[PDB]
Amino acid sequence: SMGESRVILAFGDSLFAGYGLDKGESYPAKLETALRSHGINARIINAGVSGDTTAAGLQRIKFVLDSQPDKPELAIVELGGNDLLRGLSPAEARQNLSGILEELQRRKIPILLMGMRAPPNLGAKYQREFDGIYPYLAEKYDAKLVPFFLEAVADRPDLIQKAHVHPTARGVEELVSATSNAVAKALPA
């Protein structure tokens, strides 16, 4: 094909950085290769930072854009998972994401928003509030939306790394039952 590559900014967290994976296995790297089959030669800027909250992304969006030799032709924004993990305010996550999308819109950079979903352990009130920020933002900022970015691994624990183990309340009881004998024996009489 003719011409310079199309520049796409992948602005997100561990899901873009490729946490736990080898060189070239991250979502941005594999997406770059897959777009060839759509007639697109892309250069995807991997601006994934593991652990980034919506606030962290807001704090760096201008610097990341100002650091680019070539202005992005599309920005893919994938943030909010770490706010969820931390149980942070969904309202504040929506405010922080609004600031990121406002900067992209100021620069006339098209947006694709990757929708995040809350798991049930946060409870229905939190989960409904969190989940609704993404459609709200996509309509407000005239952004395209992938409603559930992780949908294709939702029912596939074989496609997810064994990483953090946070026992549930019942899991804690299981651990206590297995280890209390050891603790009692270690405590001097």
From TrEMBL:
Q: Please give the Pfam families that the UniProt record associates with this protein.
A: Lipase_GDSL_2 (PF13472)
A GO molecular function held by the record: phosphatidylcholine lysophospholipase activity
Q: Where is the SGNH hydrolase-type esterase domain?
A: 10-171
Q: Which InterPro entries match?
A: Ester_Hydrolysis_Enzymes, SGNH_hydro, SGNH_hydro_sf
What is this protein called in UniProt?
SGNH-hydrolase family esterase
This protein's species is Altericroceibacterium indicum
